[PDB]
From a paper:
Many double-stranded DNA (dsDNA) viruses have a specialized portal complex at one 5-fold vertex of their icosahedral capsid through which dsDNA enters and exits the virion. Sealing of the portal channel is achieved by binding head completion proteins to assemble a complex named connector in tailed prokaryotic viruses, which consists of stacked cyclical oligomers creating a channel for DNA traffic. In bacteriophage [name], the [name] and [name] head completion proteins bind sequentially to the dodecameric [name] [name] after DNA packaging. The [name] adaptor protein extends the portal tunnel that is fastened afterwards by binding the [name] stopper protein.
Here we report a [name] structure of the 902 kDa bacteriophage [name] connector in the post-DNA packaging state at a resolution of 2.7 Å. We have found that the connector comprises 12 subunits of both [name] and [name], but only 6 copies of [name] in contrast to previous reports. [name] encompasses four major domains: the crown, wing, stem, and clip. In the connector [name], Pro296 is shifted upwards by 7 Å bringing helix α4 to a more horizontal orientation closer to the [name] β-hairpin of subunit i + 2. These changes in the clip domains of the connector [name] lead to formation of pockets where the C-termini of [name] bind to the portal oligomer. [name] interacts with the [name] oligomer mostly via insertion of its C-terminus into the [name] clip pocket. The most dramatic conformational change takes place by folding of loop α2-α3 into the β1-β2 hairpin that forms the [name] 24-stranded intermolecular β-barrel. The [name] β1-β2 hairpins of neighbour subunits form an intersubunit 24-stranded β-barrel distal from the portal that outlines the 34 Å-wide central tunnel of [name]. Each [name] subunit makes contacts with four [name] subunits. A second type of interactions between [name] and [name] takes place by insertion of the [name] N-terminus from chain k + 1 in a crease between the [name] β-barrel and loops α2-β1 of [name] chains j and j + 1, respectively. This network of interactions establishes the transition of 12 to 6-fold symmetry within the connector. The tunnel helices form a constriction in the portal channel with a diameter of ~12 Å between side chains of opposite [name] Gln51 residues.
Author numbering:
A (entry chain c), C (entry chain d), D (entry chain e), E (entry chain f), F (entry chain g), G (entry chain h), ...: 1 to 102
B (entry chain 2), J (entry chain 3), K (entry chain 4), L (entry chain 5), O (entry chain 6), R (entry chain 1): 1 to 109
């Protein structure tokens, strides 16, 4: 997956996240391949990633920018409440491509 | 989208030009631009700010930057914003800077 | 799906969201096609997207403008509470077109 | 469905919502036809939309003016709390006209 | 149903709600007829609307004056909490006249 | 049912509610007759309304003075919380007179 | 039931509630007679109301002085929270005299 | 039951409650007799009220000094929260003397 | 049970509660005798109250100093929350002496 | 119905007429009309407003409009409402404008 | 019962009588009566009201009536109640009027 | 037990005796006694009461009684308590009277 | 059980509780004997109280210093929240010595 | 168990708790022996206390420094919330040594 | 352990010695000792205490004792604590006494 | 796993966490190997850690930077709420490689 | 287990905890050995502690620095909320090495 | 990690050097260093601190240490921090010390 395409899908304009995305996006692609037991290879032997895997990879890369051991944070006038799990509607994007392990 | 910083402001400094015989002319020139959120003070903060010699009009929230100085100026929506007091880094964590300011008429430029 | 028609369905007048929508709308169309196992093709072989799929694509593109790792936010006069899942009344915009996988 | 009739049913007097309603109302009519599996055609071959479909279309068009990824919002002295799902009493207007898919 | 009789049942004295009521009341009468599967006709073929249907039509017309996508609102001294469903004691104003569909 | 008797049962002294009560009380009497399937007619063919029906009609007429789409309201220093359903102890006044539909 | 005896049971000294009690007490006596299916008659044919019916009539008349559509109220220094149902310990005052309907 | 004995059991020293207690205490004695189906008569034909009935009568007379339709009350700096039912530990005082109805 | 021994078990030094305790303690002793169906008599026919009954009588006499119709109270600097039932660990102070009724 | 803005107000400006020889006459003429909500200040805000040289009587909430100026005037229910301070756009989001004002007698017209 | 308005108050105006030669005598005469709730101010409001030139004693809540004027007077429980400021309609909704006032001795009549 | 009013206070008036030639002697004599609760003011109310010309020391809560006058005095625990201001009936409901007062030395008697 | 040993186990240094402990501790010893059905007598006929009974007696004597009818109390700046039942971990100290009643 | 070793396990440096610990530690050792039905004796008959009995004795001695009748306390700047039961992870330290009673 | 009163303080009075010719020497001598909790005032109470002629430094909580007088002194951790105002028994219930005080230098002894 | 790759996955730029990560990362690698019963070895006998184990090791090392005995903390402007368990979506990263123990 | 290795795993730099860790760490090693029924001895008879036991010992030693009878604490501007039990994700580190008792 | 004390500050004393003929030179020399958290005051605390003769800029939280004196100085991030008032031990429990201070320009060294 192209890094600039993920930045367009998450509406990021600066380059503050480029070092993180360059590491995180190929790992999430390989995890979609291992979790679905599906190499995503078309008729002609070529890798062809479906659209739902792309939505899943972009949204999971956005989710994993948080801190893992933190639920809420407050700093004078600003405050944040964080999600603890990946939501089920993002995890259900991988559902139409699931095969069984052999 | 729901951005923390939906505005764009310009920071200006008061610098000297000298050319030819002896010159004292100082000009407000641009330093840099940044994403920000410019908010008017709340209904409760208004009555507290009315008991000051220079009453406060705006709170400006911006990401942390050590180039921001207390003698600077802000251009925002065609208006000049003058700083009141010293810039504050929230909780000392070097993430978000808050500046207090007031409107000072229109800007030409 | 036309981008200007999506902007009319979501009451957007400016061009702030154009680069996100140009990337996100065709991915959601292909996800509806893969999730219903339905290519949405009429008698003459032409692609005819149903109205309920169009409502779903517009509302899901509006939902995915949020940050995935955030449930709440506050700055000094403003505060926001975000929805964590797509509501079931939007997910039920795919139901009358569902086929089984072959 | 006529747009001015919907504006009378929702107590709208200005023209701030006209571009949205002109897009959204025919899509909701076609979705009621697909959801009930009913073309709403009388004896003489003419389209005759029943009253409950009209109530459903007006109330669903009013519901979809909200933002899909937001449950609450605050701005100085004003605040809003939003509904997450379409209520069951609006969805139950389509119940007396439901047929089975063939 | 007469509009002035509905205004007497809901304690309305001015003419602010007249254009909404003129559109909404006959639609609710036809919805009661379709939902009970009962045309409400006496011995001589004359239309005779029962009293409980009239109470239901007036209270449902009062309920649907709210905004469908809003559960609460507040402006600086005023605040409002809205009901999201029609109460079951108003929905039970159709029960002694219910017939089966043919 | 006499209107002045209902006003004595609800502790009303002025005439602000007379136009509402004159409309609402006969409709509630006919609804009690339809809900119990009982014409309330004694030995000599005369209409004889029992005491529990009178308590039910007075308390239901007091309940229906509220606004149907509102659960709470605040105005500077005054506030109100409203009941959403008719309580079961008022509905159980009609229980000793219930017959079956023929 | 004597009205002055009810006023002694409820610790009422003035005459503010006299017109309400004169209307409400005999209706509650007839409701207890109809709800227990018991005319409360001794050996000589004389009406002998038991102590339980008297306690129940007094407490139910005190309960029905509230507004039926209100659960809470507040004005600037004063506030009230109301009970929505008659408590079961007052309803269990009628239990030792219950007969079956014939 | 003696009224001064009840006043000693409830720690009352003035005479503000005497008119209420003189009415309420014999009614509660007769209700204990009707609820237990027990006349409380010893070997020699004499009425002999047991100790648990006396505790029950005193505590129920203290409970019924409240207002029946009120759960909470506030008046400037003072506030009160009231019990809605008689507690089970007071009602269980009548348990060792219960007989069956004949 | 001796009143001064009860005052030593409850850490009472003054004589403010003497008139209440002189009335309440023998009633609780007779209630324990009737509730366990046990007259508490040794070999020589002498009354021997067990220690657990004594703990129960003292703690129940301390519990019944509260007002039965009140769960909470507040006056300007003071506030109180009261227990509504006798706790089960005090009610279990009768269990090893329980016999069946004959 | 439960409208956020149940009132109708009139905005007025102070403009010049000149005709014939030389003229200085200025007239309050209407600019536009808008839906609004005019609220008296709360019981707690009253004691805070009494410690000002010009005490505030009303808060006016209206939808956002950039034609509204601090030298304008409001006609409401046959009364003149005079502005106190500058109009405030809530949180800088350009949705709702709040104006503070005071009553200034009856209006003829 | 639990009435919102358990009291009965009398509103009075200061009107002129003239009879016979030339007369200046003004009398407080009754206008109308209404149901109301007269409440003393709270414990926290007392310390705020002590820092005023005319301290407030009572808040009077009544149903909305456009006959009520700021130059009027209230008779309540044999005492005279004098208005402080202008009557306020709560949130502009025309349902409940609040009046602030103070006690001014006994009434004869 | 948990009494609302655990104390006993004495109310005193300032009345005249005259015997024999012409006499001006006024004596504080007892009027009646009542159950009450005498509370010192809270930690937050102390700083508000320090900005008054006569600072308040005690709040006295008693059942409602129309014999209580603002020129009276209270004897409590061998001390004299002097009234500050007028007695207040809470919310106008005629149930509980609150009196503000201060200590004025020891009582002989 | 020695009173000074209990005072060392509860960290009490003054003599404010001595009159209470001298009464309460032998009653709790005899109640542990009656509750376990165990006289705690060794080989040589001598009373030998086990360690868990000693922990139970000290902690139950500390628990019973509270007021039985109070769950919470506030006094200006100080406040207290009380336990309603003896905790299960203190009651489970008597478990290894339980015999059956004969 | 040595008292100084318990003070090292609980991070205690002063001698404020010495008199309580000298009484409480051997009682908890004997309670572990009685509750596991295990005398903790090696091959040569020597007493060998396992590591988990030591951890349990130290943590239970720290737990029992609280007041048994108190769940919360507050004084003007300080406040405390107390645990009411021993946690199950401390009680599960005795599990690998449990034998059956004989 | 979690004691309500973890400190130990000493109460001192200002008493006279006279020996031999005529003497005026007054000495601070100890009266008694008690368990207590000495707390500095909170962050919000600091700004309220700065607007007094004698600012408060400490709140002292002790069990109720009628020997405590307003002219006494406290020795605590080698420092002298001087009373400000009168001792307060909380809510009149005679359980806990609160004293306000300030530090007055080191103690010799 | 390389420490600099973990620092790129967690958006860490300084060297404040280097000594913790150098100790914690290889322990988590061996824990994944023991918990999946999988040595992660390819055809040629070389160790090949999958992408899932890498994501899991990085997120678990970020989780274990918190204090284990703390759920919340606050200092005067700053406040934190901590997560008490590792989320299940991080634990499900090890699922596609699980083997059974032999 | 080495004490300096545990200090590196818990990010401790000073020597304030050294006396506690020197006592607590060997006891937790022996508890892991007895709870898993596993001496952790390799082929050559040498003790070889696995990685998950090391993670468990470090995190349990960090957890047991809290006070056992305290769930929350407040001191002017600072406050703390404590965990009551060891979390299940720390206890599940011992799971891959569990044997049965012999 | 999430440290309570993420900063490092330096404490300085004002001590005397004397060498050779007679000398009055006093130098600020370092005493010790400690972990701390230096926080600017909150938005609500700003308006309270503006009504003082020396306004407060920073709150410094540090672990408890009895070497800290009110005549000391703090070096933090190349700036001098001057103490305002006396250091406070929170609730008298000897765990955390809070110091109030203000910025006093740059430090050389």
């Amino acid at each position: 997956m192209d890094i600039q395409r993920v930045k367009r899908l998450l509406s990021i304009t600066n380059d503050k996240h480029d070092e993180y995305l360059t590491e995180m996006v190929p790992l999430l692609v390989e995890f979609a391949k291992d979790e679905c037991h599906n190499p995503f290879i078309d008729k002609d032997g070529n890798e062809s990633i479906p659209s739902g895997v792309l939505i899943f990879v972009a949204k999971a890369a956005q989710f994993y920018m948080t801190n893992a051991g933190l639920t809420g944070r407050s700093m004078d006038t600003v405050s944040y409440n964080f999600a603890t799990e990946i939501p089920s509607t993002i995890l259900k994007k991988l559902n139409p491509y699931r095969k069984m392990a052999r | 989208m729901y951005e923390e910083f939906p505005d764009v402001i310009t920071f200006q400094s008061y610098v000297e030009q000298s050319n030819g015989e002896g010159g004292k002319t100082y000009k407000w020139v641009d330093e840099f631009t940044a994403a920000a959120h410019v908010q008017p003070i709340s209904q409760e903060e208004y009555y507290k700010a009315q008991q000051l010699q220079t009453p406060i009009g705006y709170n400006i929230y911006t990401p942390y930057d050590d180039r921001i100085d207390k003698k600077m100026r802000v251009i925002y929506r065609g208006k000049i914003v003058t700083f009141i007091g010293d810039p504050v880094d929230l909780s000392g964590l070097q993430e978000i800077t808050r500046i207090k300011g007031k409107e000072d008429g229109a800007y030409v430029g």
